[PDB]
Amino acid sequence: DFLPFSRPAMGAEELAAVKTVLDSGWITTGPKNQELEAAFCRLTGNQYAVAVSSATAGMHIALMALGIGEGDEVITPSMTWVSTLNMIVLLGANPVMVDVDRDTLMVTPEHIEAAITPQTKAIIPVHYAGAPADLDAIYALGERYGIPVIEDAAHATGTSYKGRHIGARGTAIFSFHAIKNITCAEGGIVVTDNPQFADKLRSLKFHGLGRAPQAEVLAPGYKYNLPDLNAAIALAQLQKLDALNARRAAIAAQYHQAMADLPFQPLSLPSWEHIHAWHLFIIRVDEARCGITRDALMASLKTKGIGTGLHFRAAHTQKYYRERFPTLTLPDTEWNSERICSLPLFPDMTESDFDRVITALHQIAG
Ligand SMILES: O=C(O)CCC(=O)C(=O)O
């Protein structure tokens, strides 16, 4: 009875939503997309939303829409999924990786400010694991220097920062991937407060068109539209958001309590006021403190039928980036990269499950 680190919360509502779309005969981008965009604006408090085929696609067209390319620099942490780095590189721009807080894994204003040059054209903070980054300080940097801020909110559907939802202002990109807080297997959405930018996003995700028979390419774009079939599933999940996040939050609490009697070190919560979406429950496994390495712990758990994730192996430690940036050193990122792992955490997780994990942890924890 394998216990994976994540499971989608799929039930009768998701199936019913698909049945309705299949029965209507309008299966690709249409009214369900328009509805999902309207719901994300209502959810966040922002003015415009562009649904896409994934958050990676959303990042690609966001950077593309800013006109980022050869000669430009984009500040981002290395502690994030490589898709952001890849999109910066593939547009022909230069990623400038900066370090993160040692216990929250979030990019600091200091690390960002120190990397700013006249070539910096975007700053991409990540709301890590469900908690929010220090937006007030980051936007201030953005405004002082005239640099766009594009928030990676793939872990943050349901996250709040100092009384306001992530995505309420500025530009934020959410993900509907299978292990994310809400899902339609693959999908994402770009929420923004800028109408000209939103218009560019809509065109770039659909062939650069301004479909009608005499529609025409205004400027070449990609194909990243989200089918209504998947959009309807996302809408069904979005309706369940509070209950689903409430279950993750409760399980995070037990983990917290359980960790008191264990040597593994969970992340620290940011100091600012916030609401945590609890996308992941990450722990650090330092061999000298725990007696076991991170890799050994993950493999031990797997033997016990317990799955774990690794979010993330820092971008700068992966082949292409190691060879392109050989002298790049980011201590707090590397320290965590060698020691983090994500424990089972999903809305349908039971106590049999939970307790199964903790019992495996004690078995291995000394
Ligand atoms: O299954 C996918 O399409 C992507 C999975 C992913 O990005 C991940 O490693 O977390």
UniProtKB/Swiss-Prot annotation:
Catalytic residues (positions): K180
The gene coding this protein: arnB
Modification N6-(pyridoxal phosphate)lysine, positions: K180
Record-level Gene Ontology MF annotations: pyridoxal phosphate binding; transaminase activity; UDP-4-amino-4-deoxy-L-arabinose aminotransferase
Subunit structure: Homodimer.
Cofactor(s) of this protein: pyridoxal 5'-phosphate
Keywords (A to Z) from UniProt: Aminotransferase, Antibiotic resistance, Lipid A biosynthesis, Lipid biosynthesis, Lipid metabolism, Lipopolysaccharide biosynthesis, Pyridoxal phosphate, Transferase
PANTHER family: TRANSAMINASE (PTHR30244), UDP-4-AMINO-4-DEOXY-L-ARABINOSE--OXOGLUTARATE AMINOTRANSFERASE (PTHR30244:SF41)
Activity regulation details: Inhibited by L-cycloserine.
Similarity remark: Belongs to the DegT/DnrJ/EryC1 family. ArnB subfamily.
Reaction equations catalysed: UDP-4-amino-4-deoxy-beta-L-arabinose + 2-oxoglutarate = UDP-beta-L-threo-pentopyranos-4-ulose + L-glutamate
GO cellular component: membrane
Pathway where it operates: Nucleotide-sugar biosynthesis; UDP-4-deoxy-4-formamido-beta-L-arabinose biosynthesis; UDP-4-deoxy-4-formamido-beta-L-arabinose from UDP-alpha-D-glucuronate: step 2/3; Bacterial outer membrane biogenesis; lipopolysaccharide biosynthesis
Functional note: Catalyzes the conversion of UDP-4-keto-arabinose (UDP-Ara4O) to UDP-4-amino-4-deoxy-L-arabinose (UDP-L-Ara4N). The modified arabinose is attached to lipid A and is required for resistance to polymyxin and cationic antimicrobial peptides.
Organism field: Salmonella typhimurium (strain LT2 / SGSC1412 / ATCC 700720)
Identification of the protein by name: UDP-4-amino-4-deoxy-L-arabinose--oxoglutarate aminotransferase
Pfam family membership, one: DegT_DnrJ_EryC1
Listed CDD domains: AHBA_syn
Lineage: Bacteria, Pseudomonadati, Pseudomonadota, Gammaproteobacteria, Enterobacterales
Induction comment from the UniProt entry of this chain: Induced by BasR.
The protein's Enzyme Commission number: 2.6.1.87
GO biological process, one term: response to antibiotic
InterPro entries: ArnB_NH2Trfase, DegT/StrS_aminotransferase, PyrdxlP-dep_Trfase, PyrdxlP-dep_Trfase_major, PyrdxlP-dep_Trfase_small
